[PDB]
Amino acid sequence: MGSMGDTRPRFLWQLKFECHFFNGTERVRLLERCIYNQEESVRFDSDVGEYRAVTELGRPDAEYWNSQKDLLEQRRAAVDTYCRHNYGVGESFTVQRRVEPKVTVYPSKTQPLQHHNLLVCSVSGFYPGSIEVRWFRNGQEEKAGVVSTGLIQNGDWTFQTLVMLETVPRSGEVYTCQVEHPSVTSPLTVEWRA
Amino acid sequence: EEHVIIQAEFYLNPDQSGEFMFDFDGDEIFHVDMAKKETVWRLEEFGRFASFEAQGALANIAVDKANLEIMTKRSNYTPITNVPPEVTVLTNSPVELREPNVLICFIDKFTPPVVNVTWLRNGKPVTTGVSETVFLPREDHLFRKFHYLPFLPSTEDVYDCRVEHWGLDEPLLKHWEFDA
Amino acid sequence: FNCYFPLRSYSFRP
Numbered sequence: 568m569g570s571m572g573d574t575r576p577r578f579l580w581q582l583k584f585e586c587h588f589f590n591g592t593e594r595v596r597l598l599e600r601c602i603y604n605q606e607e608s609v610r611f612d613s614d615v616g617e618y619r620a621v622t623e624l625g626r627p628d629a630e631y632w633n634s635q636k637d638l639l640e641q642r643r644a645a646v647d648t649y650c651r652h653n654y655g656v657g658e659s660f661t662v663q664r665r666v667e668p669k670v671t672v673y674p675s676k677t678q679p680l681q682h683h684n685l686l687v688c689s690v691s692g693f694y695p696g697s698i699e700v701r702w703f704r705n706g707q708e709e710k711a712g713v714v715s716t717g718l719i720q721n722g723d724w725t726f727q728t729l730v731m732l733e734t735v736p737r738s739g740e741v742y743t744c745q746v747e748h749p750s751v752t753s754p755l756t757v758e759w760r761a
Numbered sequence: 762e763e764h765v766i767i768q769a770e771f772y773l774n775p776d777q778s779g780e781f782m783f784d785f786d787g788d789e790i791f792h793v794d795m796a797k798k799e800t801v802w803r804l805e806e807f808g809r810f811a812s813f814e815a816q817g818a819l820a821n822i823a824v825d826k827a828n829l830e831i832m833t834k835r836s837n838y839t840p841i842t843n844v845p846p847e848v849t850v851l852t853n854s855p856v857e858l859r860e861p862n863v864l865i866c867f868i869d870k871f872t873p874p875v876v877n878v879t880w881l882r883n884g885k886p887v888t889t890g891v892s893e894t895v896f897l898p899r900e901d902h903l904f905r906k907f908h909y910l911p912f913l914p915s916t917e918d919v920y921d922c923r924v925e926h927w928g929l930d931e932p933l934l935k936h937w938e939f940d941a
Numbered sequence: 942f943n944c945y946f947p948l949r950s951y952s953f954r955p
Contacts, residue, residue: 570877570925570932573776576840577873577927581902582821584768591763599948602902603832604841605872631954638951645948653766653783653945660810661785662764666947671855676940689855697788721853721865722894722907724788724804725834747777768947783945790945813945821950831953 579604586650595646595654596637601625615647665750666725668693670757672744675731684734686759691727696720699747702732705741736761766790766922769898770818772825773873774833779825780874795817802804803894843928844903846871850922850935856914864937865906866922870899877925878908882918914939920926 581602588595597613610624616634620626633639638639641648654662668690675685690700696718702709712733719727734742738761745754767784782792789803793815800815802808833839849867856862866878874896880887890911896904906923919938926933 568930569927570929571875571927574927574953576838577776577875578774578829578833578838579841579873580825580832581898582768582770582774582825582950586766587762588764588766589762601828603829603836604839605844605902607833607902616775627835628953632951635951649946649948650766654764656811656943656945657766657785657790660807661790669854673855691854695815719867720787722867722897722909723853724789725853727853733772759790770950781947810943811945812942814949817947817949824950824952828950888948909943 576605584649585595586646586653588654591649595645595650597642597650599642606758611641611642612757614663616643619700622689664694664724666692666694667696667750668746668748668755670744670746670755672742672757672759674759682735684736684761686732686734686742688730688732688742690729690744692721692725693727693750694725695749695750696726697749698726698728700728700730701745701747702730703743703745704734706722734761763907767898770825771874771896772822773824773875774829776875778827778875779822781822782895782897783813784898787897788935789894789897795819795822841873843926844870844872845926845928846906846933847878848922848924848933848935850920850937852937856937856939858914858916860914862912862914864910864912864920864922866924866935868906868908868924869902870903870905871928872903872927873927874904874925876901876906878906878926879907879923880910881921881923882912884919884921901911916941 578722582602585598599611600607607621609628618629619627669692671689675687714731716729741755742759745756747754772779772780783790791802794801800813846868847870853863862922895909924933
């Protein structure tokens with residue numbers, strides 16, 4: 568058993584400095600988290616202003632660092648010197664990043680029912696993640712028979728999602744996959760004619 | 762919230778493996794390559810817009826190693842509990858025959874940050890043009906990772922992403938083939 | 942330069 572060799576015990580330490588931003592940079596919270604294996608042990612929360620043990624294993628560290636007044640002063644000012652600074656560094660290509668989805672409609676290769684057409688709307692390559700993907704039959708929004716995969720992160724600063732609709736095609740109908748997204752001022756639409 | 766920037770670091774023993782990366786809303790801005798001692802931007806344009814002094818990351822990593830060893834002794838060498846990954850294979854766009862595409866191996870919810878990923882084409886390892894991300898942090902302090910294989914879709918080829926991890930008794934084998 | 946700043950990590954009590 569075991570899918571990999573070298574099964575010696577492992578020991579992991581993680582440090583996470585989280586800058587949380589509300590309403591641009593009007594409200595900023597710094598959360599410094601120290602994690603041993605899978606358990607946070609001590610943290611500095613800028614809303615608190617000093618280190619606090621999260622587990623007992625972290626109590627000695629909170630006590631020692633809280634005795635170091637230069638460190639505390641630097642960490643308390645980090646919401647400005649660190650969080651707001653780094654926010655301004657990348658604001659134009661992160662906060663303001665907008666990438667338009669590509670929208671494709673096709674029948675599923677799975678067609679389980681005669682006189683039905685299972686349609687797939689693929690929405691790929693977009694940023695940020697907030698999106699609406701909606702099916703229409705003529706001018707009528709379809710709410711029944713819709714399944715979505717939800718957001719999928721691709722790892723390259725784009726997302727994709729898949730939304731399917733079971734249809735009973737009738738002559739004269741047009742089915743539209745319509746996408747609302749911050750990258751476009753008018754919705755993207757792609758049509759499948761019955 | 763609207764947005765979060767995370768400076769995420771780790772050190773792992775006995776591997777002597779470190780990582781330093783910046784994260785914006787769950788995507789990687791950059792990491793520092795520990796071997797080349799250089800900043801690696803996740804998207805090429807990022808390196809035209811911004812800079813980061815790699816030596817700052819290396820200095821923190823040395824402290825992380827020291828703190829790891831203190832915590833290892835303080836816990837009486839309590840080791841990490843392996844958590845095996847969840848794996849999904851998908852394409853970055855709808856597949857058309859003979860139109861270049863990319864296979865994505867999506868590896869999620871695992872720790873420690875050590876994994877082995879092999880792309881197989883028709884059961885044979887393939888490496889041409891493959892690429893991968895470093896370990897991305899999760900709020901539950903597990904990790905996520907992406908591996909990529911550019912490919913030319915065809916009706917004859919099949920693919921598998923094979924993922925191995927200390928938490929897996931057997932390798933995970935996730936299949937993809939043309940949806941004919 | 943347009944520079945990301947890191948926060949420095951500090952050791953436990955020496």
